[PDB]
């Protein structure tokens, strides 16, 4: 059962320092606590912290995160979402 191991390499691509803080909003993120992170869950912790990513903003990232096209961020998927933007540069 393999589809994409990008979520795995993500944890390895980032330093332990990132992983630690990564679990910061990981709690406040999930609203229902039994699904994943969507465009709404993002603006939440992002708006109640400092960031201000509009609808189209978050939609732009999530669109790249979800490789299958579900619009939801899985566990490790939350790490690859940033990896697709970090190294991503020419």
């Amino acid at each position: 059962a393999s589809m994409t191991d990008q979520q795995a390499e993500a944890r390895a691509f980032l330093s332990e320092e990132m992983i630690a803080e990564f679990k910061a909003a990981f709690d406040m993120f999930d609203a229902d606590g039994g699904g994943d992170i969507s465009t709404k869950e993002l603006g939440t912790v992002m708006r109640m912290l400092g960031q201000n990513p509009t609808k189209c903003e978050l939609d732009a990232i999530i669109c790249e995160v979800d490789e299958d096209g579900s619009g939801t961020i899985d566990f490790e998927e939350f790490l690859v979402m940033m990896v697709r933007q970090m190294k991503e540069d020419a």
Binding site: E21, F22, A25, D27, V45, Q51, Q85
Partner: peptide, 17 residues
């Protein structure tokens, strides 16, 4: 989107121990 350490560090893991 790139340097999201801000929001990530905002609440922080809150482990302490």
């Amino acid at each position: 989107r790139m340097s999201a350490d801000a929001m990530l560090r905002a609440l922080l893991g809150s482990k302490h121990k």
